[PDB]
Structure 1
Amino acid sequence: YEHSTVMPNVVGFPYKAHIERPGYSPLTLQMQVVETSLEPTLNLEYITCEYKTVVPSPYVKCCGASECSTKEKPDYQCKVYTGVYPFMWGGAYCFCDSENTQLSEAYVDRSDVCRHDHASAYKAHTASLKAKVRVMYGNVNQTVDVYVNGDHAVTIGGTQFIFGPLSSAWTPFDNKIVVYKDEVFNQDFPPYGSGQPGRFGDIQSRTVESNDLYANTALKLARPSPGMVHVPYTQTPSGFKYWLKEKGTALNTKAPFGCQIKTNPVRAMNCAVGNIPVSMNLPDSAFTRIVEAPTIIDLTCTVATCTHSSDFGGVLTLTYKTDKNGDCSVHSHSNVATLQEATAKVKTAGKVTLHFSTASASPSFVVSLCSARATCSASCEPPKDHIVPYAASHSNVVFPDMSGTALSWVQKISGGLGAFAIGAILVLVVVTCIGLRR
């Protein structure tokens, strides 16, 4: 037997699936979603980290001159100075008063802790969804991990389950994101090779162990002060620390739909959106034949109390006449109210009690016990507590039944007005007829 259904993607919401085939007793199905994970496929662009400025000792030549050649080093800057007179702790350094020369250079290289502290720039693509779903029917109660792609097929008690695909293709990650430690940011970044000093991306590297580096930090040297041996330099501070100071608000405290965001790997968990179609193929050994199933006749329903709250605020009692004891599957054929128990025990006494939850002022639904079917309708009162720490356990519906009190008032007023208008139309028609016949 093959069946198809749709279920809501909300964590913790119980779902009852009803399956009926000729020649077999109805069976009920319990499927609950425990945890959902949404992972996007990422490709790295570049990484960034703080730096150090390697400045070596100056070269001082007494009575001579020097020239320096360019080097293939990140942001190398050399400059040769004329007319200098060093001093040291003992005395002068060279005889020549004005025939001297000092050679200065400096460059920038990534810090020694770049491998432990760095920020990565990624690009988000189409994202996949995986979930952990539990299945309950009969005497089997198992939890399985499933890919929600329309391709995965799991087996539970000799039954094939095929999930997905998700109805809504919505992802909370933008096209370009930045990941640091355990936070993600929807922030665009400058392209590789075009960084700007003082901000994010002044240093870029294709990977953590890459031997090539691109640095643009605006290093400039300066002429040494008279009678001193030093190499001065003015440079814009590191952009990584600046980004670390006013990066902004992390997406961990901005994601809609209550999506918890983790890293390693980058994923968003417990997102509430869309519906998951379910396709299945049951075996014939999971049902029960009619001959050995109980028969329920003359079943009528009533409701004792009702209060539309987030819990199961409502009880209803079923009266019936049977032939033998047994266990029956019970389900609500509507959406306004959701039951709690999936199976019930029937006895010769002729009374069973059920719990249910709703959100409408006056619900109406059809409750089925085994092969029997009966209708229920009731009036519910609002609750008093304002705020509760658990999510709602009812599908959100508010419209009352056609036979509810307010709709009854509307119906009776409209009926009176319509009858009055119909009478007026009839009197106009009869007057027109008698006038025309003359």
Structure 2
Amino acid sequence: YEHTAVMPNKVGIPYKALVERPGYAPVHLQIQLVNTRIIPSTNLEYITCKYKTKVPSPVVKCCGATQCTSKPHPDYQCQVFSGVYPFMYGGAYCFCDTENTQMSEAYVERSEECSIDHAKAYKVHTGTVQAMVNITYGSVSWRSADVYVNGETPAKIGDAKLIIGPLSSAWSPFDNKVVVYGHEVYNYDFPEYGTGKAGSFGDLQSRTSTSNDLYANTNLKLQRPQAGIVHTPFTQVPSGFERWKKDKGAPLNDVAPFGCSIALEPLRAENCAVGSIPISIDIPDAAFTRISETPTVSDLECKITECTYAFDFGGIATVAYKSSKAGNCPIHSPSGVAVIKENDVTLAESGSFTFHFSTANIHPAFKLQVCTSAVTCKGDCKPPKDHIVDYAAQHTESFTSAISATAWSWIKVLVGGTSAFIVLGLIATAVVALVLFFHRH
């Protein structure tokens, strides 16, 4: 029997319902999400890391001159400094005082740290949404499986065929561009490959961490060597990756809405409490029992003995009953007013049973379904003691949940007072108008 419904996208809060099959007693169904994962499709754009400046030995040409040539090296620099007279431990290096030239070369390469300490720039697009579900039905214990939240791929869980519909919202915490550094993800609009600027995040860009083609854009300027010294001095803008690491700011892990948890393998947002999830589960036919084969419950009376509209199961109720066959009986509240903790109870020929529930309503009024029967529970609830709790609420608050009987009385008095007072004026006008008509006639 296929049961179709919509459950909220809330991890850790179970969805409870009764599967009502004509001719068979209702079968209690419980579906709980273990986790929800939004897995976007990512494409690595480039890898950024701190640059290393490689400076080969300068060419010191005594009594002559040399010329620089271009080379296929990232940010390659070459400058010929004429009129040098270098000295070393062994004295003057060259004989000529002016016809003497030093050629300096320098280029940028990936640092050794780039193998471990680098940021990955990814293009992010929409992708697969997956979830893990925990399901029970009838006498069958908990079963779980990993399913695709797409509404097309069915999953076999405990011989039950479950279809989970697409999320009601396409929202995702990742922008079209993300930067993955370590375990953190940043919604950073990184510059495109080949357009990075010196001193900024993209000053060094590589398609892969092992790529042989490196783009480097730093103001690498060769400076003239100091008088008499053989060295290759240079000026360069500080690495933009180290600058970014200082200014990278708050990662998406810390600012993602809806309490999303960000994971990197694969990149995904987990447990985002967004929208609702349409579902369809086919319950095995062997799980259903005929009406005449189940105990019949009658003479039901529900008394709420305690109630607090706390996030936990702060309410307690006692249900008196009479039943035949004294068997097991599913318990469920189809109304959203209160969520019942117990799923089923053991019934005797006569007696009473208790159940716990959570509700936000100050005056709960809900229908409790007892296998083949139903009863209405009414009562009043006290405010909770704890201002702050470390657990999510088990119930959903409604617009009228906070309206007390006293407030409803005032609303009825105010609305009834103005309505009745206006109606009096309209009736009085119609009556006097008719009297004037009969004065003429």
Q: Which residue of 2 aligns with 1:324?
A: 325
Q: CA 1:423 to 1:162, structure 2 compared with 1: closer, same or farther past 3 Å?
A: same
Q: CA 1:220 to 1:370, structure 2 compared with 1: closer, same or farther past 3 Å?
A: same
The superposition leaves residues 150-179 of structure 1 with CA deviations (integer Å, 9 ceiling, x where unpaired) of: 122112332211012110110001111101
Q: CA 1:373 to 1:207, structure 2 compared with 1: closer, same or farther past 3 Å?
A: same
Quote the offset at 1:415 in angstroms.
4.5
Structure 1: which 5+ residue stretches go unaligned? none
The superposition leaves residues 273-315 of structure 1 with CA deviations (integer Å, 9 ceiling, x where unpaired) of: 1111111222321111111111122323222221111111112
Q: How does 1:21-420 map to 2 (within 5 A)?
A: 21-140=21-140, 141-400=142-401, 404-411=405-412, 414-415=415-416, 418=419
Please tell me whether the aligned partners of residues 319 and 353 of structure 2 are also in contact (alpha carbons under 8 angstroms). Answer: yes
Q: CA 1:401 to 1:54, structure 2 compared with 1: closer, same or farther past 3 Å?
A: closer
Q: CA 1:347 to 1:233, structure 2 compared with 1: closer, same or farther past 3 Å?
A: same
Q: 2:313 and 2:117 mapped to 1: Cα distance?
A: 51
Answering whether residue 24 of structure 2 is matched by residue 19 of structure 1, we say no
Q: 2:73 and 2:210 mapped to 1: Cα distance?
A: 17
Q: 1:422 and 1:205 mapped to 2: Cα distance?
A: 80
Quote the offset at 1:222 in angstroms.
2.2
User: Residue type of the partner of 1:220?
Assistant: K
The superposition leaves residues 262-283 of structure 1 with CA deviations (integer Å, 9 ceiling, x where unpaired) of: 2222111111111111112223
Q: CA 1:198 to 1:426, structure 2 compared with 1: closer, same or farther past 3 Å?
A: closer
Q: CA 1:437 to 1:162, structure 2 compared with 1: closer, same or farther past 3 Å?
A: same
The superposition leaves residues 11-68 of structure 1 with CA deviations (integer Å, 9 ceiling, x where unpaired) of: 1112211221221111111111111222111011111112222212222223222223
Please tell me whether the aligned partners of residues 30 and 135 of structure 2 are also in contact (alpha carbons under 8 angstroms). Answer: yes
**The residue matched to 1:103 in structure 2 has which SS?**
strand
Q: 1:403 and 1:299 mapped to 2: Cα distance?
A: 27
Q: CA 1:63 to 1:161, structure 2 compared with 1: closer, same or farther past 3 Å?
A: same
Q: CA 1:325 to 1:77, structure 2 compared with 1: closer, same or farther past 3 Å?
A: same
- Percent sequence identity is 56
TM-score normalized by the length of structure 1: 0.94
Quote the offset at 1:248 in angstroms.
1.2
Quote the offset at 1:322 in angstroms.
2.0
* Structure 1 outlier segments of 4+, above 6 Å: none
Please tell me whether the aligned partners of residues 298 and 322 of structure 2 are also in contact (alpha carbons under 8 angstroms). Answer: yes
Q: 1:423 and 1:68 mapped to 2: Cα distance?
A: 104
Q: CA 1:251 to 1:400, structure 2 compared with 1: closer, same or farther past 3 Å?
A: closer
Q: 1:111 and 1:14 mapped to 2: Cα distance?
A: 51
Quote the offset at 1:402 in angstroms.
9.6
Q: 1:239 and 1:410 mapped to 2: Cα distance?
A: 64
Q: 1:222 and 1:298 mapped to 2: Cα distance?
A: 99
Q: Which moved more, 1:223-232 or 1:119-128?
A: 223-232
Q: 2:428 and 2:108 mapped to 1: Cα distance?
A: 101
Quote the offset at 1:147 in angstroms.
1.3
Quote the offset at 1:106 in angstroms.
1.5
Please tell me whether the aligned partners of residues 146 and 154 of structure 1 are also in contact (alpha carbons under 8 angstroms). Answer: yes
Q: CA 1:436 to 1:267, structure 2 compared with 1: closer, same or farther past 3 Å?
A: same
Q: Which moved more, 1:194-203 or 1:426-435?
A: 426-435
Please tell me whether the aligned partners of residues 59 and 104 of structure 2 are also in contact (alpha carbons under 8 angstroms). Answer: yes
**The residue matched to 2:21 in structure 1 has which SS?**
coil
Q: Which moved more, 1:164-173 or 1:67-76?
A: 67-76
Q: CA 1:9 to 1:85, structure 2 compared with 1: closer, same or farther past 3 Å?
A: same
User: Residue type of the partner of 1:121?
Assistant: A
**The residue matched to 1:291 in structure 2 has which SS?**
helix
Q: CA 1:331 to 1:63, structure 2 compared with 1: closer, same or farther past 3 Å?
A: same
Q: Which moved more, 1:409-418 or 1:322-331?
A: 409-418
User: Residue type of the partner of 1:316?
Assistant: A
Q: 2:121 and 2:414 mapped to 1: Cα distance?
A: 66
Q: 1:96 and 1:424 mapped to 2: Cα distance?
A: 119
Please tell me whether the aligned partners of residues 127 and 171 of structure 1 are also in contact (alpha carbons under 8 angstroms). Answer: no
Q: CA 1:408 to 1:401, structure 2 compared with 1: closer, same or farther past 3 Å?
A: farther
Q: For the aligned residues, what is the CA RMSD?
A: 2.1
Q: CA 1:324 to 1:236, structure 2 compared with 1: closer, same or farther past 3 Å?
A: same
Please tell me whether the aligned partners of residues 74 and 213 of structure 1 are also in contact (alpha carbons under 8 angstroms). Answer: yes
TM-score normalized by the length of structure 2: 0.93
Q: 2:321 and 2:98 mapped to 1: Cα distance?
A: 118
The superposition leaves residues 319-341 of structure 1 with CA deviations (integer Å, 9 ceiling, x where unpaired) of: 23222201111111211111111
**The residue matched to 2:88 in structure 1 has which SS?**
coil
Quote the offset at 1:423 in angstroms.
5.7
